[PDB]
Amino acid sequence: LRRIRPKLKIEKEFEEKKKIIEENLKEAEEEGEEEAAEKLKEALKKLEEAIKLHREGANPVEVELEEVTAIILNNLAVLLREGEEELAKELEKAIKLLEEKKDAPEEERLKAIAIAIIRSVLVLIKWEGDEETIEEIEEILENRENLSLEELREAYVRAEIAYLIESPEAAKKVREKYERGAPLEELLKDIEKIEKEA
Hints:
It is classed as de novo protein. Keywords: intrinsically disordered protein, DE novo protein. By secondary structure, the protein is mostly helical. The protein has one domain. Helices cover 77% and strands 0% of the residues. The chain contains nine helices and no strands. Helix 4 runs antiparallel to helix 5 and helix 7 (149-165) packs parallel to helix 9.
């Protein structure tokens, strides 16, 4: 299957996101992977709560909270299809963090969503693979409360770059802009462009 973790701030997103989950469940039902197919039925479950809460009129901090929950859950069963249930435990903790903070302050909501996207980058790097940075980013998540949002979005920027290193050469260009101190809004534009590039 596939994994995509973007940045928010529209229905075309959940549109193309649903397309992945569909053929995923399509392949999950065509295959004996019924443990994954449950997550597939469970991923679209959180995608309805994502597409409903958007068309119902909630703020993006609650919509993406169910989108990422549908993103990771669609991504959780991919690791289950590959027998990577050891790494799938790391994404279930991200789900547990996503579910326990849906009744949390607006800043506590996106604070977990950032950790959710980061942890998903983290497990994908280990699956698709530069070593001390994992022992640098995974230790950042242990003290998740001692940090700010500007540091977690930077960590996702650093983590996504490290992943795209082990994916083009255009990742260190964004890393170069990180080293020049470029604004973090710009470090997202080129990063999400790379996701739009693929």
